[PDB]
Ligand binder design. Structure first.
Ligand code: CLA
Ligand code: CLA
Ligand code: CLA
Ligand code: CLA
Ligand code: CLA
Ligand code: CLA
Ligand code: CLA
Ligand code: A86
Ligand code: A86
Ligand code: A86
Ligand code: BCR
Lengths: 171, 89, 168
């Protein structure tokens, strides 16, 4: 059975029946690493990047909140981490991020040990996910599809911005 | 369970992940890891042997430190490749 | 199966909703090794009750009428200890000790956790359900006080500013 994405290569089997399975796993990481771990990672990376990209672009198009610490004046999205970490913004958000991440680690452990928590599920805002499994699945693919794009998007923004010192267009 | 007999151990002893990896892949990884470790050592050696400029322990670099850990991994990976080969996978 | 408080984790068995304040919260699973949660409940209540008084006292001492006499005027809560003196402190300690040793059996016994008889006339002439409601109120307030105590103390030694001083 050949993969849809790479017709000349065999299909990755362990990834079958998963959201966003286009048959693309040329190096076969799935055959070796636990799938639930991989799935959780893809989702987390995507969600983080989605927000990261938005933040980068937003600040670059102005957006600074009010009142703004003086040290934060005249800072691009890039070259803002250090001013912020000095002020205390980064540290004050790191604390909460850490808390959630630690509890999440417990969830991941239980998921891998077999508890029933689907990878990436934190039971948040499921009300808007629809009722029919079909619509639920479409929503999930929507998140994943946007997420994959976001990962690539963020990379471009940060790399192009630093390399050529440019603003929003071609950030 | 892990008790084994013969001339080669079963793949179960290589863990829950490497037990499914092909022998060749492990070999490639092993060689690469050893290379990184050796490179790190040689490069760091120059830093330690360069006149002055290493005061306050400036010779210690985060990348080289991490790279140096490839050496032990190289051993493990090369041993694992052999086990996988004998096991047929 | 799944905790109500944390929707993505499995609830420990001992947390079954019987006790007040059981929102199914035990992520680290500290309830399994324990034979029962009685001693732990006693401690939760004791710690919380002390914290309640502490937070109130700290605020009062900083912004409130002090007792007549010098050595009883320092607003700084931490400095107060030394200022007031060993005699005053010792007498309080001894009193607390008496109560603690008198109710020793209660703490290590099998009675209603947290009940030492100081119920006033309250918690009387009321159905079991009403009683539970009161008990839940106490545990909620206890937990709030404990969190507040940490914040108040930390703010004092980190920001070095009065509790009610809100300046940015
Ligand atoms: C860190 C980000 C990340 C992670 C963890 C994953 C993880 C996964 N993706 Mg995925 N993906 C990503 C980003 C990511 N993706 C992006 C940005 C895109 C857009 C191009 C896609 C597009 C995509 C498709 C189209 C498909 C997957 C699939 C998969 C699954 C199998 C592939 C695999 O295990 O490789 C995970 C490993 C990595 C992503 C990186 C490992 C790279 C190695 C370790 C370094 C070597 C680099 C080089 C050799 C030097 C797995 C759950 C397949 C699937 O079945 O999904 C359910 C699938 O069909 N992904
Ligand atoms: C990966 C996520 C991420 C990270 C690390 C940062 C990091 C940063 N942002 Mg930022 N931001 C993000 C996402 C992110 N942002 C997103 C998604 C938005 C869109 C609303 C923004 C909008 C935004 C503005 C408008 C400003 C920053 C600013 C800053 C800097 C100071 C921190 C601060 O005041 O936060 C403030 C962050 C917000 C108010 C985000 C809005 C609330 C979020 C979306 C909800 C979080 C969901 C969970 C609780 C810091 C470099 C400030 C700065 O110093 O600019 C130079 C600033 O003025 N960001
Ligand atoms: C397009 C992006 C997108 C989409 C389609 C989804 C979709 C989904 N997420 Mg999700 N998520 C996203 C982004 C997204 N997410 C991001 C960026 C984060 C990190 C902040 C998360 C964090 C998150 C958690 C923690 C959980 C989910 C869950 C879910 C699923 C439950 C259905 C649901 O919550 O409502 C989906 C319905 C919608 C998203 C419709 C909303 C339409 C958009 C959002 C308009 C909103 C306006 C604007 C975007 C708000 C500003 C945000 C930004 C500027 C900061 C569903 C599949 C839950 C789950 O069980 O997953 C299996 C769950 O536990 N998500
Ligand atoms: C002559 C040397 C020698 C040899 C041939 C073996 C052979 C073996 N050891 Mg072993 N071992 C040795 C010395 C040796 N041991 C010493 C000196 C120690 C330290 C006291 C250990 C500690 C050790 C542990 C803790 C484990 C093994 C395991 C194994 C088996 C699988 C190898 C593997 O997965 O590596 C591949 C390993 C890696 C790729 C990880 C690299 C990590 C680096 C080294 C750090 C295999 C039978 C495993 C086993 O039997 O599983 C049940 C296992 O879990 N060994
Ligand atoms: C975090 C506090 C700290 C500090 C300031 C130092 C300071 C020093 N260490 Mg040291 N060390 C520490 C923690 C620390 N150590 C710990 C926790 C370990 C155990 C892993 C070591 C293991 C260690 C070794 C093995 C060596 C040093 C060396 C040195 C000297 C030069 C390297 C240097 O400054 O850092 C440089 C490091 C960085 C710039 C970043 C490293 C980040 C890592 C990789 C993560 C200097 C006196 C070297 C030396 O001069 O001794 C001969 C040396 O060979 N240290
Ligand atoms: C955790 C409890 C706690 C502790 C350890 C302290 C400790 C202290 N307080 Mg303080 N205080 C507290 C709660 C506490 N307070 C509360 C809740 C209030 C508000 C009513 C006050 C109001 C207050 C004032 C107005 C003053 C102090 C002062 C002082 C210091 C001298 C002792 C004194 O005169 O107390 C005075 C104690 C009271 C006025 C009443 C205490 C209320 C107790 C806790 C009621 C509980 C009794 C208990 C249930 C039954 C007995 C227990 C057992 C021993 C039998 C000392 C450092 C004095 C000072 O500034 O020193 C420099 C001072 O002038 N406190
Ligand atoms: C009951 C607990 C409690 C309460 C009421 C407060 C209250 C306060 N703290 Mg504090 N703190 C606490 C616990 C608490 N802290 C703990 C446990 C610690 C760590 C030991 C600290 C460490 C700390 C530091 C280091 C600082 C404060 C500061 C402050 C003040 C400004 C806080 C601020 O800007 O938040 C702003 C809040 C946000 C930016 C995020 C928005 C809030 C989220 C999104 C939702 C909030 C809703 C939630 C239900 C809160 C309701 C509970 C409350 C109303 C009772 C404020 C009086 C600061 C200050 O200057 O005070 C003098 C300050 O510098 N606190
Ligand atoms: C309690 C509760 O329920 O709350 C609810 C609230 C709410 C909102 C309903 C919920 C939600 C969902 C959320 C938060 C959804 C938000 C999702 C989000 C934020 C999705 C962004 C994607 C960004 C992308 C795709 C970027 C593309 C960017 C691309 C493709 C680029 O090419 C950018 C580009 O730069 C490059 C790289 C190169 C440049 O030269 C050129 C340009 C500029 C073009 C939840 C989860 O249900 C919870
Ligand atoms: C078919 C295919 O595809 O490939 C084929 C063809 C090909 C390529 C010919 C083949 C091969 C591959 C082979 C033979 C591969 C590998 C053989 C190998 C790799 C054999 C030993 C490594 C031993 C080490 C590293 C020992 C110690 C490492 C030690 C002792 C360290 O202490 C590291 C150290 O780190 C500490 C802890 C502290 C650090 O700070 C610094 C130092 C450095 C001191 C195969 C097998 O036929 C498969
Ligand atoms: C010479 C003369 O006549 O002028 C006088 C005039 C004037 C103005 C009066 C003066 C004064 C001041 C005086 C005399 C001040 C006396 C102050 C005094 C005596 C102050 C505190 C006792 C503290 C207690 C009890 C604190 C906590 C007790 C607590 C916190 C408990 O939690 C008990 C506890 O039970 C709970 C509730 C629950 C139980 O499960 C657990 C335990 C057992 C732990 C002068 C100036 O000095 C001299
Ligand atoms: C009973 C008895 C006794 C005792 C005995 C004993 C106690 C023994 C022990 C023994 C032992 C206990 C031994 C050991 C040995 C060890 C060894 C032999 C080791 C080796 C090692 C190695 C080989 C290494 C390797 C490596 C490297 C090199 C690097 C990489 C990684 C690794 C680490 C792997 C006596 C005599 C007193 C008396 C009589 C009786």
């Amino acid at each position: 059975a050949k993969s849809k994405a790479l017709p000349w290569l065999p299909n990755p089997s362990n990834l079958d029946g998963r959201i966003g399975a286009n048959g693309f796993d040329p190096l076969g990481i799935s055959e070796y690493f636990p799938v639930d771990y991989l799935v959780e990672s893809e989702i987390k990376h995507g969600r983080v990047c989605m927000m990261a990209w938005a933040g980068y672009v937003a600040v670059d198009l102005g957006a600074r909140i009010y009142p703004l610490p003086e040290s934060m004046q005249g800072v691009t999205s890039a070259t803002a981490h250090d001013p912020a970490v000095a002020f205390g913004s980064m540290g004050n958000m790191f604390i909460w991020i850490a808390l959630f991440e630690m509890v999440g680690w417990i969830g991941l452990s239980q998921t891998l040990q077999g508890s029933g928590r689907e990878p990436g599920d934190f039971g948040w805002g499921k009300q808007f996910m629809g009722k029919t499994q079909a619509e639920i699945d479409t929503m999930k693919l929507k998140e994943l599809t946007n997420g994959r794009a976001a990962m690539l998007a963020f990379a471009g923004v940060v790399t192009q911005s630093v390399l050529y010192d440019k603003g929003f267009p071609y950030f | 369970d892990m008790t084994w007999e013969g001339e080669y151990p079963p793949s179960k002893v290589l863990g829950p992940i490497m037990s499914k990896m092909p022998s060749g892949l492990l070999a490639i990884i092993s060689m690469a890891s050893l290379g990184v470790c050796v490179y790190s050592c040689v490069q760091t050696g120059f830093l330690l042997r360069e006149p002055g400029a290493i005061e306050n322990g400036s010779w210690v670099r985060w990348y080289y430190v991490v790279e140096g850990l490839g050496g032990p991994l190289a051993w493990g990976t090369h041993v694992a490749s052999w086990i996988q080969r004998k096991n047929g996978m | 199966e799944m905790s109500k408080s944390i929707p993505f984790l499995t609830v420990p068995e001992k947390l079954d909703g019987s006790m007040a304040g059981d929102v199914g919260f035990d992520p680290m699973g500290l309830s399994d090794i324990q034979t029962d949660l009685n001693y732990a409940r006693w401690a939760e209540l004791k710690h919380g009750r002390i914290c309640m008084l502490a937070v109130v006292g700290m605020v009062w001492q900083e912004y409130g009428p002090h007792l007549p006499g010098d050595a009883y005027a320092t607003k700084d809560p931490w400095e107060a200890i030394s200022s007031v003196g060993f005699a005053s402190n010792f007498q309080t300690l001894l009193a607390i000790g008496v109560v603690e040793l008198a109710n020793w059996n209660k703490y290590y016994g099998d009675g209603t956790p947290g009940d030492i008889g100081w119920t006033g006339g309250q918690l009387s002439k009321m159905n079991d359900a009403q009683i539970k409601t009161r008990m839940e109120s106490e545990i909620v307030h206890c937990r709030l006080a404990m969190i507040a105590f940490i914040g108040a103390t930390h703010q004092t030694f980190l920001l070095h500013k009065g509790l009610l001083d809100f300046s940015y």
